[PDB]
Design a protein around this ligand. Structure first.
Ligand SMILES: Cc1ccc(C(=O)Nc2ccc(CNCCN3CCOCC3)c(C(F)(F)F)c2)cc1C#Cc1cnc2cccnn12
Ligand SMILES: Cc1ccc(C(=O)Nc2ccc(CNCCN3CCOCC3)c(C(F)(F)F)c2)cc1C#Cc1cnc2cccnn12
Lengths: 256, 273
């Protein structure tokens, strides 16, 4: 069991709110992160969210997935993970001075492909893959999570934006989102940055008129990565590849 | 459940075998290590060891403990973990040119104290803590395990008692060397072993290196005449680390501190600077 008794965890600095609950830095046999429902009387929806989140985190033991360590129910609903030193891939690419060699951009893509390949193998659909949810622990190891701290529409597949079918999230919607991460790495830019109304992107991507401008990839982006990227961004859901095939293509091409 | 179906794991280069199986580099959703029992006809003792090892690894989720990922039963008994890039603390200190600043030696000791404090909180006794079992993943994060490769061969054809002699004896507490108790391993035997790791970090040397009769070390440590020479600690070893070291190396089992107290001391020690 992964339930942590009461009176063991210390809660330190409040980092931010996210998904459901607030994240804190904390102390429990070393540094930890603590996501805590800051509500006196939880609703059933809140309780169920917490159980669903623990339910999935429990199933993960992989170096590229944020390390779940346990949970607590009293005094508040709380999920405990490893603390990560550094900042998100989003921060490095679009909020900072930082410079990546093409070797490291390929490696980030590969570590991300491993973690996503692992999740999909255990029937877990992320639903919100994006560079802000890819953490660079010690600026060296990718850690996938849902860190919380609008936003997500750039990584939304057409079918997801449209919302035609009850809950449109699929392995392939995750694949599309990974495609958009590859765009970020190989261009250094968020897609649709030439278009200035958020409402148009939503209409045009869902309509199928707008997709990322693949001309803006770098001169030294390998040609196979470019082809892959475009295989992931296919507008029809079922033309997209699977992560075993994606992982194999990025590990083949990174050998060279 | 953490059972991995057959025909998913790929086994690559053989890293080393010892008494509890053979470790390989492997592929399963990325790099992994694979400990595989390379025995034609396992005994009940061997089968039970495998179940006990999985049993305890299953209970661990902590950044300073080697990450268990799963196990397989067919075609062979196998435990799967994260692959670690780098080399053991033993390699860096006694088999290498590497130089650690005192900041990093204190940090290695602290990360090791966190992992051990975590294990003891879940009632897990390591039994074989030593610098060869403390891995420096990416030369930055301590990962405690039992890596312990005794030969480089496809299996270990010695006794466990030879294996311990070639390695483990320096980190054995007096009570453990004697074997006067029925099963002499305790939280405190682990504490003694951590004491000897602190000696390694703060001296850069294995203890008793001014002696070569391995048989004498066994008699004299167990007899209580010989303990590590604390004079050989560095000029810039903080005085509180030295005092802690000696509290861990107490010859009487129950005079030794507990890991909550050890960790609290090392985090205060590190606070200063
Ligand atoms: C405390 C905590 C708690 C939870 C999570 C987290 O990552 N949770 C989480 C949530 C979802 C999913 C995947 N989607 C499943 C969707 N399901 C339906 C909706 O409800 C959830 C289940 C995944 C997965 F699978 F991607 F791993 C992970 C992260 C943290 C964290 C931190 C952390 C560590 N150092 C730092 C530094 C700064 C900020 N923070 N920080
Ligand atoms: C594949 C594998 C499998 C298992 C273990 C492992 O470390 N297993 C293991 C064994 C013992 C103990 C602690 N002993 C107390 C509990 N025990 C239960 C059974 O009865 C009493 C003993 C612990 C613990 F708790 F410390 F984690 C862990 C390590 C590996 C490995 C590798 C590995 C990863 N990259 C590298 C690189 C080079 C060499 N290798 N390599």
């Amino acid at each position: 069991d992964w339930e942590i008794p009461d009176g063991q965890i210390t809660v330190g600095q409040r980092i931010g709110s996210g998904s459901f609950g607030t994240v804190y830095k904390g102390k429990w046999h070393g540094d930890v992160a603590v996501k805590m429902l800051n509500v006196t009387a939880p609703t059933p929806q809140q309780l169920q969210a917490f159980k669903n989140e623990v339910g999935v985190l429990r199933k993960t033991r992989h170096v590229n997935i944020l390390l779940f360590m346990g949970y607590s129910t009293k005094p508040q609903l709380a999920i405990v993970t490893q603390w990560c030193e550094g900042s998100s891939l989003y921060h490095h690419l679009h909020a900072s001075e930082t410079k990546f060699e093409m070797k490291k951009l390929i490696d980030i893509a590969r570590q991300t492909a491993r973690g996503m390949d692992y999740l999909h193998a255990k029937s877990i659909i992320h639903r919100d893959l994006k560079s802000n949810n890819i953490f660079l622990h010690e600026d060296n190891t990718v850690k996938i999570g849902d860190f919380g701290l609008s936003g997500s529409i750039l990584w939304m597949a057409p079918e997801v934006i449209r919302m035609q079918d009850s809950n449109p999230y699929s392995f392939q919607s995750d694949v599309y989102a990974f495609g958009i991460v590859l765009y970020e790495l190989m261009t250094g830019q968020l897609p649709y940055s030439n278009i200035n109304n958020r409402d148009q992107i939503i209409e045009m991507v869902g309509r199928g008129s707008l997709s990322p401008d693949l001309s803006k990839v770098r001169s030294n982006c390998p040609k196979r990565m470019k082809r892959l990227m475009a295989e992931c961004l296919k507008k029809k859901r079922d033309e997209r590849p699977s992560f075993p095939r994606i992982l194999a293509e990025i590990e083949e091409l990174a050998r060279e």
